[PDB]
Write a protein that binds this DNA or RNA. Structure first.
Length: 118
DNA sequence: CACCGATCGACT
DNA sequence: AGTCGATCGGTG
């Protein structure tokens, strides 16, 4: 099932829906949603350790996010009990995906390929 | 210094 | 109007 999680992400990068995403934030959201469905638990853990200095990065409610940082442009993550801040440059959306994908035990080359498409 | 925040400009 | 997200000022 790690071989399967890898296959899935690889398929996603090839999928039409992924291609359909117009901007980085759009790909970012679809990356998160896909990651979850693969392993809700691991995504839960990987997420606890993911936060900023003064901003929470992930929470189960728009409220918590809007409450710790100034403007974070929170956005619910489709098919998920989570919310994530969106007011971040591309390099930081990559850091986030990297953190999460390392925690979920994905190979490095895949992570590198994923981030390169954000 | 390397990392983070969030303003405010670019593009629609 | 609204969204995105690079740039640059903060900070530890």
């Amino acid at each position: 099932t790690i071989k399967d999680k890898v296959r899935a992400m690889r398929e996603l990068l090839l999928s039409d829906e992924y291609a359909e995403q117009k901007r980085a934030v759009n790909r970012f959201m679809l990356l998160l949603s896909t990651l979850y469905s693969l392993d809700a638990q691991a995504f839960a853990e990987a997420t606890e350790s993911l936060h900023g200095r003064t901003r929470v990065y992930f929470a189960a409610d728009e409220q918590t996010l809007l409450k710790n940082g100034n403007q974070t442009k929170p956005k619910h993550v489709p098919g998920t009990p989570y919310w994530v801040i969106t007011n971040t440059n591309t390099g930081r959306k990559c850091s986030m995906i990297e953190h999460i994908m390392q925690s979920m035990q994905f190979p490095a080359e895949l992570i590198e390929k994923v981030c390169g498409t954000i």
